[PDB]
């Protein structure tokens, strides 16, 4: 029952993809600050979107048993859903390897969300990262998965 | 709109503390796997708890405008709330500095949550991380704060 | 002779600051691409500016004998000098320590320049990072130098 | 202009190579100290050459949109051009991948140059890193390229 | 001069390596270990995870080491009470152009260092007696064992 | 508890700390022979290892889970060949001004320098052994001086 990096040595390298999303719940004082350009640290969404891409590459360094893999693609979307006072984040990671990139996609979303928080923290300490969840995955033995 | 790493050279040095929490909602399959020791990768809670502490230390590397700071204390708790079918993660970070440690606490919880996910991913890809939020903080200009 | 991280343990801690700059020479093709918004990878200046801030924090990990130290302030500016077909980067770093932060400022500028190259090389592989040089530094026994 | 790590998933993996160079212009005092063995921190060229190799491997961590890839070869040369009062750095990186390694070669040279600066700034803060540029690349769709 | 040996034209093949390391304990460190540590947590559990993490960080620690995609990592940290010794074993696997001996060695060395960190409050004299390779396979030179 | 934690030292004073460790690499005849020739073609083993040690001291917090990250104020590493003994000796002294010791930084510096010696010579002999990584001295902290 001890920790281990699962042996995937005898698995073929195949096209892999994963998509996840996360949301940041906005207060009124954070929504208005966001529309005016932030709290003085710069564009919250721009900094968070790039932070997501970087995070995807740093996933193996953050998740102990995660496999170090070469990434062939990373897309990150950070948008304001004004009607919901919510910030939606989506990330898709791709690779050609023996194991999936769900952690990379999830991590990109979680860190981008953490960055939105960092960029609006001044206006509202109570902002909440609500859900971080997988939306899609394809490539491995189990094939395609849809939320 | 340009990103900036807020200058804190001209700022009061005080004792700082921040506490955050996060949750991972489990499916029946994941709960069962958890109670049996995991999916074969090791104890989900033990590995996630350690991941949280490591993440606290890597915060400045993940959050673009976060200040690199010496951390004097990090406590992380990852617990199974059986009846609620969810795992609760709590993290408290302390330091003596010119800037707060809310991001270290938030990041610790987010990465611990992501690790719980990685450790149970095989049972259910649909597990959800949510409610990553700050619970307490003190030492800043804004003073004491509690959810 | 033998490499060493200079012993500065018994040196008094003082305010430290350093400013450096760097330039990236552009071709007409790269300039044109820049004004249209990039080559398809995104805004070259925006990405490079953040890369610079991040690079300042990673300095000690890149320069072998550099002293690791908490930074209290990081400012990075990336500007397009159109008629000159040049991108200028400037960075100022601050802290309170026993050694200077010249490297952090130099590194921030260099990596930002490297990122500008990455964001535009698809247009022209021959782009050149012309210079990376110090402009100012203060602190320590021996302060106050300016080019 | 939204940032993105270009999708190269379906591109075939091929042998890639890239070579770049950089220079550090010296002052009389830097040159003198360099010839004496440094400023007391150690041999500037030796530490810089090793720093360049390490830098190549850290390229993806420094350049936001760069693809993390497995490097299969890294050569770095750091030499003093006494007459020109200049230090020349050259680096050739290789890999088996879907994208080129121009960034790794450029980064290796830039960081090696930064390290030379670090190893001699105690003698002269005015040293200048100049001409970080690509000299050659090959292996991809575009084919061969060389600075003429 | 230093170089990352060019293995671009070498074929990708299954490669594996196993190494081990020991940490000699004092009576006081053993006593502390048996009681759950010095207050920082379970020494063996933290050390075992540190070893896996170390395997992944090998290329960043060993200058001329090649960065490669690891396919498997196993680490075991056991207390040999009577001997007053903690034994660490690690096996790394991959499909690459170069071996993973460094990954296995580094995993054992860092796990041992972590055992030291987790118990040094009880005794500063703890010793990492040795780190050595036990087996490797997959390369041009094929199989090797101590 | 028995659960991991980065010990709370927030209220402790920031004092001058120092630590010295050593490590050895036992050589085979082939490795010893390779060393005297300048290595196995990857470069000077002792030179690369010495730098690796300094770099390792700085990466200690990133390698040891519960170690406190702190600003190092000094790092010295020596890697020497003890011919008659058929082995390489490594010693490292680390310094800082903090609330916790640097025994880990000194121990890690020696361990990684040793691993690097192995990497730089394993082509000659895979049976090289890293023996005795141990602390020799440390001062600062409530416990005071301590010497092997």
């Amino acid at each position: 029952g001890r920790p281990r990096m699962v042996d995937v040595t005898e698995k073929p390298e195949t096209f892999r993809t994963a998509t996840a999303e996360a949301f940041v719940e906005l207060t009124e004082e954070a929504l208005s600050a966001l529309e005016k350009g932030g709290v003085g640290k710069g564009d919250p969404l721009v900094v968070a979107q790039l932070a997501g891409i970087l995070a995807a590459k740093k996933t193996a360094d953050l998740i102990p048993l995660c496999h170090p893999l070469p990434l062939t693609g990373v897309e990150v979307r950070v948008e304001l859903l004004k009607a919901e006072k919510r910030v939606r984040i989506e990330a898709t990671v791709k690779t050609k390897a023996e194991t999936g990139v769900e952690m990379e996609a999830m991590t990109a979303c979680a860190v981008a969300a953490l960055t939105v928080y960092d960029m609006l923290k001044a206006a509202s300490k109570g902002l909440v990262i609500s859900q971080v969840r997988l939306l899609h995955k394809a490539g491995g033995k189990s094939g395609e998965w849809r939320r």
Side-chain angles (χ1 to χ4, degrees), chain A:
Chain A
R2 74 178 195 276
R4 64 166 53 68
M5 268 189 47
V6 185
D7 185 12
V8 296
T9 297
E10 298 154 27
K11 286 180 172 59
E13 291 196 296
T14 58
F15 306 150
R16 306 292 193 122
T17 185
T19 301
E21 87 186 324
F23 299 86
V24 180
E25 302 295 296
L26 294 174
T27 54
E28 195 58 43
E29 29 206 75
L31 173 63
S32 55
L34 173 59
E35 291 186 302
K36 79 173 191 292
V39 300
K41 295 177 61 175
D43 192 313
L45 310 192
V46 169
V47 178
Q49 188 271 353
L50 194 67
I53 296 175
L54 292 164
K57 293 199 292 189
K58 295 173 168 63
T59 300
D61 188 59
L62 301 176
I63 312 305
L65 308 181
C66 187
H67 295 79
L69 304 168
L71 305 183
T72 54
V74 181
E75 290 281 337
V76 177
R77 296 178 51 161
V78 182
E79 60 194 319
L80 208 209
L81 300 182
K82 50 286 160 294
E84 306 174 58
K85 289 180 293 173
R86 245 166 48 158
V87 170
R88 173 179 188 273
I89 301 150
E90 184 186 314
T92 289
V93 178
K94 302 172 70 170
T95 186
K96 293 196 290 186
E98 312 92 336
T99 315
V101 286
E102 303 103 291
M103 292 318 300
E104 280 71 17
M106 289 284 280
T107 301
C109 289
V111 179
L114 288 170
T115 301
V116 172
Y117 180 81
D118 183 62
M119 302 296 287
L120 296 168
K121 192 166 72 289
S124 297
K125 307 139 189 60
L127 291 184
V128 175
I129 295 300
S130 44
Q131 356 209 16
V132 184
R133 63 199 180 187
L134 229 215
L135 292 186
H136 172 85
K137 168 217 231 245
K141 300 153 64 163
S142 30
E144 188 170 60
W145 182 85
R146 284 188 180 249
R147 183 167 204 89

